[PDB]
Design a protein around this ligand. Structure first.
Ligand SMILES: CCCCCCCC/C=C\CCCCCCCC(=O)O[C@@H](COC(=O)CCCCCCCCCCCCCCC)COP(=O)([O-])OCC[N+](C)(C)C
Ligand SMILES: *[C@@H]1O[C@H](CO)[C@@H](O[C@@H]2O[C@H](CO)[C@@H](O)[C@H](O[C@H]3O[C@H](CO)[C@@H](O)[C@H](O)[C@@H]3O)[C@H]2NC(C)=O)[C@H](O)[C@H]1NC(C)=O
Ligand SMILES: *[C@@H]1O[C@H](CO)[C@@H](O[C@@H]2O[C@H](CO)[C@@H](O[C@H]3O[C@H](CO)[C@@H](O)[C@H](O)[C@@H]3O)[C@H](O)[C@H]2NC(C)=O)[C@H](O)[C@H]1NC(C)=O
Ligand SMILES: *[C@@H]1O[C@H](CO)[C@@H](O[C@H]2O[C@H](CO)[C@@H](O)[C@H](O)[C@H]2NC(C)=O)[C@H](O)[C@H]1NC(C)=O
Ligand SMILES: CC(C)CCC[C@@H](C)[C@H]1CC[C@H]2[C@@H]3CC=C4C[C@@H](O)CC[C@]4(C)[C@H]3CC[C@]12C
Ligand SMILES: *[C@@H]1O[C@H](CO)[C@@H](O)[C@H](O)[C@H]1NC(C)=O
Ligand SMILES: *[C@@H]1O[C@H](CO)[C@@H](O)[C@H](O)[C@H]1NC(C)=O
Ligand SMILES: *[C@@H]1O[C@H](CO)[C@@H](O)[C@H](O)[C@H]1NC(C)=O
Ligand SMILES: *[C@@H]1O[C@H](CO)[C@@H](O)[C@H](O)[C@H]1NC(C)=O
Ligand SMILES: *[C@@H]1O[C@H](CO)[C@@H](O)[C@H](O)[C@H]1NC(C)=O
Ligand SMILES: *[C@@H]1O[C@H](CO)[C@@H](O)[C@H](O)[C@H]1NC(C)=O
Ligand SMILES: *[C@@H]1O[C@H](CO)[C@@H](O)[C@H](O)[C@H]1NC(C)=O
Ligand SMILES: *[C@@H]1O[C@H](CO)[C@@H](O)[C@H](O)[C@H]1NC(C)=O
Ligand SMILES: *[C@@H]1O[C@H](CO)[C@@H](O)[C@H](O)[C@H]1NC(C)=O
Length: 1194
């Protein structure tokens, strides 16, 4: 071997210097540029260099490799081969084997008068199997700020006809302007002239160069990237013979019923062609005696009852109302609640977001034409320069807002969050103007001379949507796009309306203002909300006819719902007023026109209404004393229920008395005691059946059903007691009044067979019970039940979240804008709990997405999930911190650097006095820092800032994502890897996201193989606490309804004697009522949530109020046949049940039909109408017939 040239003494032009000829042996390197030899091509570094090379040559080589390094360094396997073509060309130790100089001439030294030999020209023999493997591995490298091929900018011509041989000729040719002298390559695989070219090892875009440099991406290599992933979409519909397969199982279940049912009548119709009485008797006697007592001791009874009422209802002073949505919709110990408790403790609560979807409707899209060459690039309307200036003006004004609070000003700079503070304090604003750093200057500056612009803001936008974490454009612009706060701005968070990569086509601009959310602190939260109110007002009063903004504040949903939840109290008040008017006017039988205001029960009806309201208030007050807080579901469903039950009892009693004829020689208190002893068992059965049902239903973990059950049970019981005592005393007093000829309400001025009882008895009961009508009724009701069972499993789950808002609100527009434009959703945090090692090869492989770490690790699994992005609603990559930590610590990167004597972190921008690299640049140092080096360099990484020479640093993104536990070796605590969800528009979307995130977390926890369950991965998102209730709502409904109905069943079959048949008939009728309630749900579009569940558990209590009465009046009867017993029970009890509860609630609902609120008109008006009329029909038209048919004899 031998050399051809050494040193650089000649000069071509500018600074280009021709290498100086020397054909001696290879020089031992001067020990000066060892760093360079390990940076250019370490293939020569095995010390005893004896390199033909020169330190003045190595450092002049690197200067020419500057631009080729920037483009081709994207793909390590490419730039690797490119270097092997240069070192050997310049200073390899066997240079003479593959080189032959051609043109040289003497050079004069201005230093010694010594003529030096320059190297003017020469030819370079390169193998063909080398140039093909080189060009073929780089042809796929894409350029920055474009989708072209990187060779198009390095060939000297189009990248469409770049042969592998012409590209090498252009690089060595001085015609480009870089080569100080041109080298003529000679391509040949076989030795010619006794001279055989060089062919060193080569690597493709798929093979990795080192056990630490990951292979090339399929963006930059066509062979690495294969078949896309795909999930199997299961619909899981049965569709027996073409239709839903449930529509059919029933219609076949029904046709069978009419034939097996109508096939027995027409079959027979052609054929004809001791302990119970002991418990049912002591109750009558007890109630008779106590009724007489209460009728002859009104003063004592009423006084003690009023004292009790006051003692119980004075607890309303301690009344608390629950409005915080977390406490409302989240169980205090649910999985999501514990996860939120864990995340808020180790990482601080999730922040508050104020977004802004700006759009330019007037402007049109325009075309961008690159100067040198390239296809046209169209830009959306909002990406116009004028619209960008106006949006920058709007944002700078949004920063003004001060929003004084508590006699102090509250600026955004004060409330927002700055990741890397107090070094940099601006704060996180996520807009597309951060690419230009919120500067009109940086946005409006172009580089070029007339007739064309070299660069423009289009070029910067295109470059930075591709690489949003750069610190300089480094190509004809030299501007960073990191953002004033420090840290990348991802194009999918700041744009909307494009198509899958083309942020050029964006039609909307998103602008987020992250604000701190505080964990157990109220002064700061008040400050944030006080600033948000002024932000909302400002954005609402901004005209800018060029823009259409759809905004939101963190405090906006709560305000919109508190604004819609009123202006209908004027309707509820009229509803209750009409209910009370009817109750007051209907208790009294007329019997005469000239005797009206004397036989009137207005005062007694007022007393009954007051007793009912008193029962409500005593329940609320007792539970206020105990400490249970109220709720807006309770405050609305308790009055309805308690009024229904109380009015039913009042009418039952008053009418059972009015239709009674007094025996002779029998006094008033004895007559009333007899009437009450014969009427009280039914009211007691109903009251006990409902109380036990509700109290027993207060076992669920749903905060909406638990509190409601408690409140309603106590109210029903207290109302029963207050009635049985106070109302009987007042009934005795009013009977005295009416017998002493005293006039009605004003004062002291001196049998009935009600018109309804004469209708149910004379025209309705006989007709309904004829032999040609009972089968019709049963057929119709079984058909409706069959329909309900068929369309049952098609009921929705969840609440829309757009119907809780008024229709004239801006949140409706914001939701439309989200669904129509946004491409990202709420962020997800896959929190890896405390207990992982992180300081071992395997402990790191389980978490990596990288070179050597496993293929099923946490980061790789989240990456796959994001590759699905439709099955798994995870849209983007995990963005792990440990990969960035390793990239930072790698010696090549050379961001880490410690002080030599102090072992202190020398920044990457430092005078370089005595600071050495953290990891030695050797084969052992390349590896990951697995031992104590990991934990010795991690804190310095997390404290590093975004240095222009280093890169992004690990402070603005991971200081909060990594928890370090000082003391005891200072291990790592809990950490998270945060990604983003896909746009979630409906409750189905949110529940689907919750399910599949949980699935991914469980998969990762499985693969990690933890000893026991010491720790685990879990995802945290903001809406998880609000949507975790819909993951068990079906079984919650099942449990609640079944338990409530079984309690009703047992209580009935116990109190009513022991008749299981009567109890089972009643239970079956109430189950029918519930199934038909679900059918009406499906048919009118009511959804299954914590409001519908409360209304169903409530209806379970009015079904009883109808059935129990009708069925008990039938059971305890001594008529002859079932038909006559049924019609007698119907007349007697159903005349009071139809007039008391049915007509009252019907007037109420008909007044309530004018609600003006969607949540109300959907979940209360419709549910109440359905419940009331369904229960009325079922009881009064199906208990009669079913009992007539299969009732218990006696
Ligand atoms: C001891 C035994 C206990 C356990 C077993 C008990 C089982 C038997 C007991 C009761 C019946 C059980 C029915 C299960 C529901 C269907 C299951 C299913 O396929 O999921 C469906 C749930 O469908 C819904 O979303 C609404 C379902 C609510 C059912 C509640 C019935 C309770 C009342 C009954 C009466 C009183 C009950 C209490 C009396 C005891 C899937 O629905 P989806 O896909 O979300 O819908 C959207 C579809 N869409 C887009 C096309 C519109
Ligand atoms: C979304 O953005 C893409 C760009 O990534 C748009 O694609 C471009 O479409 C415009 C339409 O005017 C074309 O100007 C451009 O095509 C240019 O190059 C071809 C050469 O093949 C030339 O024949 C055309 O005259 C033009 O100069 C497209 N560029 C590319 C590379 O696709 C696309 O239109 C946008 N989508 C929508 C829905 O607007
Ligand atoms: C990812 O998301 C969807 C899979 O669940 C699916 O969305 C696509 O885009 C829109 C969504 O509204 C729809 O496409 C429309 O236009 C096509 C013509 O190509 C019609 O055939 C459709 O009926 C529809 O009107 C589809 O819902 C769907 N099709 C596309 C892409 O247009 C995507 O296909 C999914 N893709 C992947 C790879 O995840
Ligand atoms: C955000 O903080 C940055 C520093 O991180 C500030 O930087 C700018 O300061 C001036 C504007 O007030 C500009 O004239 C400077 O050119 C710019 N800094 C540099 C690097 O030159 C900036 O003030 C803060 N906010 C804004 C609105 O930019
Ligand atoms: C714009 C593009 C073409 C530039 C990329 C090609 C450049 C980097 C290539 C082509 C020719 C090469 C040069 C050829 C000759 C020498 C002299 C030697 O003693 C040091 C290396 C040096 C200085 C090379 C540096 C890299 C080089 C300049
Ligand atoms: C270069 O790559 C192409 C792939 O398109 C292949 O067809 C060709 O055989 C390769 N030539 C080589 C490796 O010499
Ligand atoms: C509002 O912001 C502007 C921006 O330059 C600033 O000049 C002004 O002092 C701020 N306060 C105002 C206008 O009250
Ligand atoms: C604000 O505080 C100062 C100092 O306590 C006080 O003098 C001033 O009156 C306060 N402002 C108002 C409006 O009360
Ligand atoms: C970005 O611009 C050039 C291009 O690479 C680079 O040399 C420079 O160091 C960078 N900017 C700064 C401020 O260092
Ligand atoms: C709106 O656009 C017009 C036309 O570009 C411009 O003159 C005006 O300043 C913009 N802003 C307004 C009208 O507030
Ligand atoms: C993932 O795990 C290991 C990789 O080392 C291997 O056994 C397994 O086949 C890999 N899976 C796939 C699909 O390649
Ligand atoms: C770099 O480190 C030095 C250490 O003295 C510090 O002064 C400087 O602010 C740092 N620069 C950054 C973090 O950008
Ligand atoms: C750094 O410290 C080591 C150990 O004392 C020493 O050998 C080395 O020469 C020092 N380097 C510099 C640049 O001072
Ligand atoms: C968990 O892994 C199984 C098989 O390894 C896979 O079928 C399932 O889809 C994974 N869960 C996800 C991707 O959520």
């Amino acid at each position: 071997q031998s050399c051809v040239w050494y040193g650089e003494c000649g000069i071509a032009y500018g600074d280009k210097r021709y290498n100086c000829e020397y054909s001696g042996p290879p020089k031992p390197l001067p020990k000066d540029g060892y760093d360079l030899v390990q940076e250019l091509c370490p293939g020569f570094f095995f010390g005893n260099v004896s390199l033909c090379c020169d330190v003045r040559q190595l450092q002049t080589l690197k200067d020419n490799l500057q631009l080729p390094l920037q483009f081709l360094s994207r793909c390590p396997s490419c730039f690797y081969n490119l270097l092997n073509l240069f070192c050997e060309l310049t200073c390899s130790p066997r240079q003479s084997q593959f080189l032959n100089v051609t043109a040289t001439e003497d050079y004069v030294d201005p230093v010694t008068n010594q003529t030096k030999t320059n190297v003017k020209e020469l030819q370079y023999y390169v193998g063909q199997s080398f140039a093909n493997a080189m060009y073929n591995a780089c042809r796929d490298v894409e350029a920055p700020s474009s989708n072209d091929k990187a060779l198009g900018l390095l060939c000297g011509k189009d990248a469409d006809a770049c042969n592998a041989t012409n590209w090498i000729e252009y690089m060595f040719n001085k015609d480009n302007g870089q080569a100080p002298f041109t080298i003529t390559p000679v391509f040949s695989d076989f030795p010619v002239h006794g001279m055989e070219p060089m062919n060193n090892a080569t690597k493709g875009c798929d093979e990795s160069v080192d056990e630490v440099t990951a292979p090339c991406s399929c963006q930059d290599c066509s062979i690495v990237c294969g078949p896309k992933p795909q999930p199997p979409p299961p619909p899981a519909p049965w569709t027996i013979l073409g239709l839903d397969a449930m529509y059919v199982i029933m219609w076949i279940t029904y046709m069978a019923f009419l034939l097996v049912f109508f096939g027995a009548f027409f079959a027979v119709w052609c054929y004809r062609k001791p302990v119970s009485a002991a418990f049912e008797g002591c109750l009558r006697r007890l109630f008779t005696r106590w009724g007489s007592f209460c009728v002859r001791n009104p003063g004592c009874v009423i006084f003690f009852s009023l004292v009790f009422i006051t003692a119980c209802s004075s607890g309303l002073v301690f009344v608390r109302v629950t409005t915080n949505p977390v406490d409302l919709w989240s169980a205090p110990s649910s999985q999501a609640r514990l996860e939120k408790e864990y995340f808020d403790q180790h990482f601080g609560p999730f922040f508050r977001t104020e977004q802004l979807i700006i759009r330019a409707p007037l402007t049109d899209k325009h075309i961008y034409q690159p100067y040198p060459s390239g296809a046209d690039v169209p830009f959306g309307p909002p990406l116009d320069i004028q619209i960008l200036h106006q949006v920058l003006d709007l944002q700078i004004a949004i920063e003004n807002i001060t929003a004084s609070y508590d006699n102090e000003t509250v600026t955004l700079q004060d409330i927002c969050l700055a990741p890397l503070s107090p070094y940099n304090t601006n704060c996180t604003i996520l807009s597309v103007l951060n690419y230009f750093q919120n500067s009109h200057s940086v946005l409006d500056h172009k580089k070029g001379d007339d007739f064309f612009v070299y660069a423009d803001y289009h070029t910067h936008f295109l470059y930075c949507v591709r690489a949003p974490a750069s610190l300089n454009d480094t190509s004809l612009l030299h501007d960073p796009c990191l953002g004033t706060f420090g840290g990348p701005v991802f194009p999918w968070l700041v744009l909307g309306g494009y198509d899958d990569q083309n942020y050029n086509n964006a039609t909307a601009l998103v602008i987020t203002f992250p604000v701190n959310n505080y964990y157990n602190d109220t002064e700061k939260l008040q400050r944030a909300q006080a600033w948000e109110k002024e932000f909302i007002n400002f954005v609402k009063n901004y005209k800018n006819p060029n823009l259409t903004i759809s905004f939101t504040a963190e405090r906006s949903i709560e305000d919109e719902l508190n604004r819609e939840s009123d202006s209908d109290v004027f309707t509820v008040v009229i509803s209750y007023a009409i209910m009370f008017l009817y109750i007051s006017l209907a208790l009294g039988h007329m019997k005469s026109c000239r005797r009206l205001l004397v036989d009137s029960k207005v005062s007694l009806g007022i007393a009954g209404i007051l007793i009912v309201l008193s029962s409500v208030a005593c329940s609320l007050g007792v539970f206020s004393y105990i400490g249970l807080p109220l709720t807006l579901i309770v405050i609305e469903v308790i009055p309805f229920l308690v009024l229904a039950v109380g009015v039913d009892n009042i009418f039952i009693l008053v009418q059972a008395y009015q239709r009674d004829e007094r025996l002779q020689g029998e006094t008033l208190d004895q007559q009333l005691g007899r009437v009450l002893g014969e009427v009280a068992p039914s009211m007691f059965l109903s009251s006990f059946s409902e109380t036990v049902a509700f109290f027993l239903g207060a076992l669920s973990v749903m905060p909406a059903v638990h509190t409601f059950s408690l409140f309603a049970g106590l109210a029903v019981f207290i109302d029963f007691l207050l009635q049985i005592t106070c109302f009987v005393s007042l009934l005795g007093l009013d009977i005295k009044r009416q017998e002493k000829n005293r006039l009605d309400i004003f004062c002291c001025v001196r049998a009935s067979e009600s018109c309804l009882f004469r209708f149910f008895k004379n025209s309705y009961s006989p007709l309904l019970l004829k032999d040609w009508m009972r089968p019709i009724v049963i057929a119709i009701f079984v058909g409706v039940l069959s329909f309900s069972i068929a369309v049952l499993n098609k009921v929705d789950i969840g609440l829309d979240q757009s119907l809780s808002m008024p229709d004239d609100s801006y949140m409706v527009d914001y939701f439309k804008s989200i669904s129509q434009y946004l491409h990202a959703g709420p962020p997800v945090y896959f929190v890896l709990e405390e207990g992982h090692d992180y300081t071992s090869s395997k402990g790191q492989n389980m978490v990596c997405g990288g070179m050597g770490c496993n293929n099923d690790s946490l980061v790789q699994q989240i990456f796959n999930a994001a590759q699905l992005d439709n099955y798994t609603r995870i849209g983007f990559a995990p963005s792990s911190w440990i990969d960035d930590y390793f990239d930072w610590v790698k010696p090549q990167s050379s961001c880490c650097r410690v002080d030599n004597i102090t072992d202190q972190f020398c920044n990457a921008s430092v005078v370089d006095p005595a600071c050495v690299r953290c990891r030695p640049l050797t084969p052992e140092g390349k590896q990951r820092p697995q031992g104590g080096d990991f934990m010795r360099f991690l804190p310095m990484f997390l404290s590093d800032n975004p240095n222009p020479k280093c890169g992004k640093g690990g402070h603005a993104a991971y200081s909060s994502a990594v928890n370090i536990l000082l003391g005891h070796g200072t291990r790592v605590g809990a950490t998270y890897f945060m990604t983003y969800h896909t746009v979630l528009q409906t409750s189905a979307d949110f529940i689907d996201a919750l399910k599949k995130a949980r699935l991914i977390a469980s998969n990762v926890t499985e693969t990690m193989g933890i000893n026991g369950s010491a720790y685990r991965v879990f995802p945290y998102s903001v809406f998880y606490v609000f949507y975790e209730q819909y993951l068990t709502i079906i079984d919650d409904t099942i449990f609640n309804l079944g338990v409530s109905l079984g309690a009703i069943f047992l209580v009935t079959m116990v109190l009513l004697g022991c008749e299981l048949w009567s109890a089972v008939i009643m239970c079956a009728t109430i189950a029918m009522v519930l199934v038909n309630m679900f059918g009406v749900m499906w048919l009118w579009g009511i959804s299954l949530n914590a409001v519908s569940l409360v209304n169903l558990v409530m209806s379970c209590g009015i079904s009883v109020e109808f059935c129990s009465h009708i069925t008990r009046a039938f059971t305890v009867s001594m008529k002859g046949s079932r038909v006559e017993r049924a019609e007698e029970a119907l007349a007697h009890m159903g005349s009071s049940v139809f007039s008391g509860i049915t007509l009252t609630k019907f007037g109420g609902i008909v007044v309530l039909a004018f609600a003006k609120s969607q949540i109300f008109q959907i979940f209360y008006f419709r549910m109440y109408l359905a419940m009331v009329l369904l229960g009325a029909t079922h009881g009064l038209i199906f208990l009669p017939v079913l009992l007539s048919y299969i009732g218990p004899s006696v």
